[PDB]
Amino acid sequence: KIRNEDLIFNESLGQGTFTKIFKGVRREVGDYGQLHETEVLLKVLDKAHRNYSESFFEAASMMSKLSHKHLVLNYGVCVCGDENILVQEFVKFGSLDTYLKKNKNCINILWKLEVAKQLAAAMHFLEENTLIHGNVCAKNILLIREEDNPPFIKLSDPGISITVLPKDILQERIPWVPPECIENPKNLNLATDKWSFGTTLWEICSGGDKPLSALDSQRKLQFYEDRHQLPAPKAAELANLINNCMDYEPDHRPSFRAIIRDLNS
Numbered sequence: 001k002i003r004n005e006d007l008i009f010n011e012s013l014g015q016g017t018f019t020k021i022f023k024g025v026r027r028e029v030g031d032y033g034q035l036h037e038t039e040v041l042l043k044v045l046d047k048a049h050r051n052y053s054e055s056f057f058e059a060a061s062m063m064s065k066l067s068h069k070h071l072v073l074n075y076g077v078c079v080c081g082d083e084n085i086l087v088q089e090f091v092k093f094g095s096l097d098t099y100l101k102k103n104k105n106c107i108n109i110l111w112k113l114e115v116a117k118q119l120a121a122a123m124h125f126l127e128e129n130t131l132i133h134g135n136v137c138a139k140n141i142l143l144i145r146e147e148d149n150p151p152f153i154k155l156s157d158p159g160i161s162i163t164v165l166p167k168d169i170l171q172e173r174i175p176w177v178p179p180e181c182i183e184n185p186k187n188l189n190l191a192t193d194k195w196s197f198g199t200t201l202w203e204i205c206s207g208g209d210k211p212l213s214a215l216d217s218q219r220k221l222q223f224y225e226d227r228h229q230l231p232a233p234k235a236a237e238l239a240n241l242i243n244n245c246m247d248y249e250p251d252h253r254p255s256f257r258a259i260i261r262d263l264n265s
């Protein structure tokens with residue numbers, strides 16, 4: 001529970017779903033009582049979307065009860081007057097999808113494999129704790145350090161749950177959102193994240209391209225209706241795993257233990 005008076009808002013860094021994102025600085029008493037001014041990532045719920053307040057912070061809170069080296073650190077929340085604000089560690093190099101596009105001509109299968117193994121390790125930990133993320137995607141992978149020593153990533157918070165989001169938002173998040181959740185958002189399950197994990201591998205192999213971006217929301221719907229799969233990326237080293245993960249039968253998608261074994265071979 002951070003004080004409004006200890007937070008300084010600086011540059012806007014874009015927007016998430018019903019949120020506004022800013023780089024900031026938090027003034028804090030740290031260990032040994034030393035005074036720190038710490039770079040922070042601030043996520044602000046739109047006042048115009050206050051109805052979704054509980055769900056977002058419930059999301060960030062539930063995961064913050066679990067500490068893990070591949071899960072992002074949340075410092076707390078500010079009840080900052082009229083706005084609710086998540087205060088999060090500032091990750092030096094930002095979101096993976098932006099990174100993949102700018103650095104495409106420098107990323108090889110060895111780099112992709114380490115990032116995939118790290119993400120699966122995070123997902124395996126969640127799976128062992130029966131905790132559903134619900135929004136696995138390249139935008140929500142944060143790059144802590146660049147390869148020199150491998151790269152190092154963290155999974156960000158999931159944001160507002162698909163189980164309360166407007167249907168048109170869900171449709172635009174095809175193919176991250178699995179077919180059974182389009183049929184019924186209340187079908188959100190552990191198997192949901194295996195599908196989205198497959199979609200995120202496709203992103204990682206596709207230099208930051210967004211699958212099915214050329215398809216409007218009605219065509220995305222008919223894509224699931226006809227049981228299509230994503231095309232193999234030109235770099236197709238992960239295409240079989242992508243397709244095995246994006247299985248239209250939720251009960252057939254592999255455990256992350258099996259996925260990690262597949263990545264290791």
Ligand SMILES: Nc1nc(Nc2ccc(S(N)(=O)=O)cc2)nc(Oc2ccc3[nH]ccc3c2)n1
Pocket residue numbers: 013015016017021041043072088089090091092093094095098139140141142156159
């Ligand atoms: N923890 C964290 N740290 C950063 N750091 C950062 C941002 C921008 C730059 S840059 N290229 O301008 O120099 C550098 C570093 N950025 C984010 O962005 C996210 C990630 C996922 C998100 N899902 C919904 C909103 C959202 C926001 N999260």
